[PDB]
């Protein structure tokens, strides 16, 4: 599938869950914490760099936040937790700005769904996107989805018809992508990791 479509005012549920890294997306899971890929959270590392909170080209910031930590899934799942500093150097509160997104806890194939993410954001001024299509294979913590995705959607939410996350996208082949699908497991590694 390719329908794919700007959200240019990212302050609503649920676009304001959604992070841009430079070179990728997350998504808020809770107090403090973003979810996306290892290479996203982990070469954000090298420049460390801050997280911008829902960007859109015309929603009101967000503000951007500095890197606390992060945490990778020790398995091999494409998976990180990144922890913010909660105040922005422009004073802004990242829980106040942000909301948490809800786990589907599981999907079928044929559901449809949502990416929503940065793709190609150094081109485009981190403008944010929505594209549509179906789940085609879920196998263990991999599946695949065929909503139309390009460099930059690295770490974005999937999320099902009701706005809750199903997983991360993590690789394309596109309109034949792969994704972290969150099981049980990975769903508490998640929980575990988000701050109090």
Do not use: W
Not at 128 to 150: K, L, P, R, V, W
Not at 162 to 184: D, Q, R
């Amino acid at each position: 599938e390719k329908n794919v479509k700007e959200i240019t005012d990212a302050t609503k549920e649920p676009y304001n869950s959604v992070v841009a890294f430079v070179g990728g997306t997350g998504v808020v899971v809770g107090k403090n914490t973003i979810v996306t890929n290892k290479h996203i959270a982990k070469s954000n590392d090298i420049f460390k760099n801050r997280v911008s909170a829902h960007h859109s080209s015309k929603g009101k910031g967000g503000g951007n936040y500095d890197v606390k930590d992060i945490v990778e899934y020790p398995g091999k799942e494409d998976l990180a937790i990144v922890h913010v500093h909660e105040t922005s150097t422009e004073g802004l509160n990242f829980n106040k700005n942000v909301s948490y997104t809800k786990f589907a806890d599981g999907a079928k194939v044929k559901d449809r769904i949502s990416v929503i993410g940065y793709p190609k954001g150094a081109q485009t001024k981190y403008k944010m996107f929505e594209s549509t299509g179906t789940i085609n294979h879920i196998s263990g913590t991999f599946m695949e989805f065929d909503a139309y995705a390009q460099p930059g959607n690295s770490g974005s939410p999937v999320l099902n018809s009701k706005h809750e996350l199903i997983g991360i996208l993590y690789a394309g082949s596109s309109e034949k992508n792969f994704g972290v699908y969150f099981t049980p497991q990975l769903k508490e590694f998640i929980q575990n990791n988000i701050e109090k």
